[PDB]
Design an enzyme around this catalytic site. Structure first.
Site, mmCIF file in Angstrom:
data_model
loop_
_atom_site.group_PDB
_atom_site.id
_atom_site.type_symbol
_atom_site.label_atom_id
_atom_site.label_comp_id
_atom_site.label_asym_id
_atom_site.label_seq_id
_atom_site.Cartn_x
_atom_site.Cartn_y
_atom_site.Cartn_z
ATOM 1 C CG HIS A 24 46.939 38.626 38.988
ATOM 2 N ND1 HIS A 24 46.016 38.750 37.690
ATOM 3 C CD2 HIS A 24 47.063 37.388 39.242
ATOM 4 C CE1 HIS A 24 45.441 37.612 37.612
ATOM 5 N NE2 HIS A 24 46.009 36.509 38.276
ATOM 6 C CB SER A 81 45.602 34.228 36.350
ATOM 7 O OG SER A 81 44.730 33.600 37.413
ATOM 8 N N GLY A 82 45.704 35.275 33.252
ATOM 9 C CA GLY A 82 46.417 35.986 31.853
ATOM 10 C C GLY A 82 46.218 35.328 30.787
ATOM 11 C CG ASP A 139 44.730 41.712 36.169
ATOM 12 O OD1 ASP A 139 46.212 41.505 36.818
ATOM 13 O OD2 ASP A 139 44.300 40.333 36.051
HETATM 14 C C1 LIG Z 1 40.585 39.412 47.702
HETATM 15 C C2 LIG Z 1 40.196 40.214 46.573
HETATM 16 N N1 LIG Z 1 40.232 41.773 46.580
HETATM 17 C C3 LIG Z 1 39.705 42.117 45.468
HETATM 18 C C4 LIG Z 1 39.534 43.224 45.144
HETATM 19 C C5 LIG Z 1 38.866 43.537 43.863
HETATM 20 C C6 LIG Z 1 38.286 42.704 43.223
HETATM 21 C C7 LIG Z 1 38.719 41.086 43.584
HETATM 22 C C8 LIG Z 1 39.107 41.053 44.826
HETATM 23 N N2 LIG Z 1 39.404 39.729 45.469
HETATM 24 C C9 LIG Z 1 39.379 38.100 45.083
HETATM 25 C C10 LIG Z 1 40.175 37.657 44.052
HETATM 26 C C11 LIG Z 1 41.125 38.629 43.268
HETATM 27 C C12 LIG Z 1 41.907 38.182 42.347
HETATM 28 C C13 LIG Z 1 42.074 36.462 42.154
HETATM 29 C C14 LIG Z 1 41.228 35.719 42.791
HETATM 30 C C15 LIG Z 1 40.288 36.131 43.837
HETATM 31 N N3 LIG Z 1 41.369 34.420 42.597
HETATM 32 C C16 LIG Z 1 42.413 34.606 41.646
HETATM 33 C C17 LIG Z 1 42.954 33.454 40.906
HETATM 34 N N4 LIG Z 1 42.589 33.367 39.427
HETATM 35 C C18 LIG Z 1 40.883 32.870 38.971
HETATM 36 C C19 LIG Z 1 40.709 33.038 37.571
HETATM 37 C C20 LIG Z 1 39.640 32.875 37.160
HETATM 38 C C21 LIG Z 1 38.468 32.216 38.261
HETATM 39 C C22 LIG Z 1 37.225 31.964 37.748
HETATM 40 N N5 LIG Z 1 36.569 32.560 36.553
HETATM 41 N N6 LIG Z 1 36.427 31.384 38.479
HETATM 42 C C23 LIG Z 1 38.968 32.313 39.688
HETATM 43 C C24 LIG Z 1 40.078 32.422 39.934
HETATM 44 N N7 LIG Z 1 42.763 35.884 41.160
HETATM 45 C C25 LIG Z 1 43.921 36.338 40.477
#
Ligand SMILES: Cc1nc2ccccc2n1Cc1ccc2c(c1)nc(CNc1ccc(C(=N)N)cc1)n2C
Ligand SMILES: [Ca+2]
Lengths: 235, 55
Positions: A42, A185-186, A88
């Site tokens: 992503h 992320s990553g 991912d």
């Molecule tokens: C909007 C949605 N549709 C989904 C479908 C499947 C699983 C999650 C989903 N989400 C929530 C979601 C999905 C991807 C996300 C996100 C929140 N928030 C991020 C940003 N990075 C990130 C990394 C680590 C953490 C943490 N450990 N607290 C919190 C956020 N990414 C890269």
């Protein structure tokens, strides 16, 4: 990293940083070898084009040792979908080999069997990056690390509002306010066995950061080992 | 009788993979299995997984 410790000299040598055009580190990576960097699929969206900085420990001061490398080829996982966040994972090949030195060294890749057991069996993993420090806050200027305990799949699913596929795994705290965050992320989730560190997963996503009752979820590298080899031999 | 990578990873520094009854250890790329068939000797100056600090 929300509420974590700081990475000292040579403590997090496998950390790589994905910097965009404006040199903004939008994501992280794990150094696998001279040419390959492991990262989340992503992350390949927050930039039209980027570079990989290694040896960087403080985004502000340029204390030397930092080295930027250009991405030659980008091997993304063909099964990744934002609609599910499954698969991912993505491997990046750099045009120029990374020179290993203090604060620059690859992480060891394990084997599916003896990872799933022995490694995932451990009670804690290490995660790191130059990402947000509090959610609705600044993105760290110093590389931070944090010991995140392994969360069992069932509790993981029970806490997550979204479907936790078999290519994922939870790690973090239920109440304690410590957890990776946006911008991490990553980034790598390595696990120490005796004295060596093996890559167990990569920072994928989570609901908020250090959110009480939620855990940070990562990509289970174990499930992608053969894919990683494929991509390292190029495929 | 002898078996189990469960005892203590079979005294392997890294990968343990029991075969027949023996433990049989392995080392990550960049490491060479010591003559004792248990330890893993780093081959290069900067082996993977090692903290490149004032060690
Ligand atoms: C909007 C949605 N549709 C989904 C479908 C499947 C699983 C999650 C989903 N989400 C929530 C979601 C999905 C991807 C996300 C996100 C929140 N928030 C991020 C940003 N990075 C990130 C990394 C680590 C953490 C943490 N450990 N607290 C919190 C956020 N990414 C890269
Ligand atoms: Ca710097």
């Amino acid at each position: 990293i929300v509420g974590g410790q700081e990475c000292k000299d040579g403590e997090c040598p496998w950390q790589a940083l994905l910097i965009n055009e404006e040199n903004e580190g939008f994501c992280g990576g794990t150094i696998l070898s001279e040419f390959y960097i492991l990262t989340a699929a992503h992350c390949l969206y927050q930039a039209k084009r980027f570079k990989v900085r290694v040896g960087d420990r403080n985004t502000e001061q340029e204390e030397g040792g930092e080295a930027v490398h250009e991405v030659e080829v980008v091997i993304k996982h063909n099964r990744f979908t934002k609609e599910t966040y499954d698969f991912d994972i993505a491997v990046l090949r750099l045009k120029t080999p990374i020179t290993f030195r203090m604060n620059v060294a690859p992480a060891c890749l394990p084997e599916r069997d003896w990872a799933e057991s022995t490694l995932m069996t451990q009670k804690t993993g290490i995660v790191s990056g130059f990402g947000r420090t509090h959610e609705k806050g600044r993105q760290s200027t110093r590389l931070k690390m944090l010991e995140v305990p392994y969360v069992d799949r069932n509790s993981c699913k029970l806490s997550s509002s979204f479907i936790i596929t078999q290519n994922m795994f939870c790690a973090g705290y239920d109440t304690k306010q410590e957890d990776a965050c946006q911008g991490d992320s990553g980034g790598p989730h390595v696990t120490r066995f005796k004295d060596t560190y093996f890559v167990t997963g990569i920072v994928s996503w989570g609901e908020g950061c250090a959110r009480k009752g939620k855990y940070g979820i990562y990509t289970k590298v174990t499930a992608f080992l053969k894919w990683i080899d494929r991509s390292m031999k190029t495929r | 009788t002898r078996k189990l990578c469960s005892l203590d990873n079979g005294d392997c520094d890294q990968f343990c993979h029991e075969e027949q009854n023996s433990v049989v250890c392995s080392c990550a790329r960049g490491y060479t299995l010591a003559d004792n068939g248990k330890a893993c000797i780093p081959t290069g100056p900067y082996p993977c997984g090692k903290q490149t600090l004032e060690r």
